[PDB]
Symmetry: C2
Subunit: 149 residues, 2 copies
């Protein structure tokens, strides 16, 4: 079913904003196999639609965000890193919610879930268009997946 608004752009802008704001780090948007090491996933429910969003990061990239965002700097994944990915997922979703409210595209957010595992893969099971948008940095890559019915 066609969306009543282009819901991808606000998630892309919010992710770049949140990482520049909270971690002084800039991601380069890329041209849109897909795997990562730590992912933040959140469900969304609205009147005219329901869906989910995920942000997947390479370990190297998550660690650099950790170093710049909190000062904690472990050599590998841990609870600290997952808490950070969880809060980033909430902030990105919140930023996109505020932008999409301008176009009458309203939704409420659930609570985030964080998955950790070298090279795990993600498959949104929504009956709608699945959009995958990759990002790169000198520390590793990330990708957002979004699907609304």
């Amino acid at each position: 079913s066609n969306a009543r608004a282009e819901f991808v752009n606000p998630f892309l802008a919010s992710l770049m904003n949140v990482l520049k704001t909270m971690a002084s780090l800039e991601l380069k948007p890329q041209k849109p196999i897909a795997r990562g090491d730590v992912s933040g996933l959140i469900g969304m429910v609205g009147a005219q639609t329901r869906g989910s969003m995920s942000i997947t990061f390479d370990e190297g990239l998550a660690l650099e965000i950790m170093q710049n965002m909190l000062g904690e700097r472990p050599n590998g994944l841990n609870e600290e890193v997952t808490d950070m990915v969880g809060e980033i997922t909430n902030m990105v979703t919140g930023g996109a919610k505020r932008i999409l409210a301008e176009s009458g595209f309203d939704f409420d957010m659930a609570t985030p879930v964080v998955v950790s595992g070298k090279g795990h893969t993600i498959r949104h099971k929504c009956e709608g268009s699945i959009i995958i948008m990759p990002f790169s940095s000198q520390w590793g890559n990330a990708f957002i997946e979004i699907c609304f019915e």
Copy 2:
């Protein structure tokens, strides 16, 4: 804690009726520092007027393949797109059943869309303000666990 039994009963009833497979439930408990790993997980968010939260079902590969063989009559090669589709439908059916039971107790919520994660030995960590409850399960084909958090 009113949401614990409806979710636990729903996973056992979905697998017993739809895949003719019996899971052995261990006593649910507040998750702490305990190891909770699996190979394929279904994750879904829930939003109600006065509550919100998330649920995950994690399966060992052996158990997922056994469920798939029972629900289709042909054992899949590995955790292919057909296995992830099945984990998504199981996540929807378990949440749908819990939602119907909790609605009779005045606990109302709507579900988001399920997301399925694949990765040998991956871990799941819910981030919500309420208590994270883990419900372990066992079978000779492998283990599974439900994690749930409502705020």
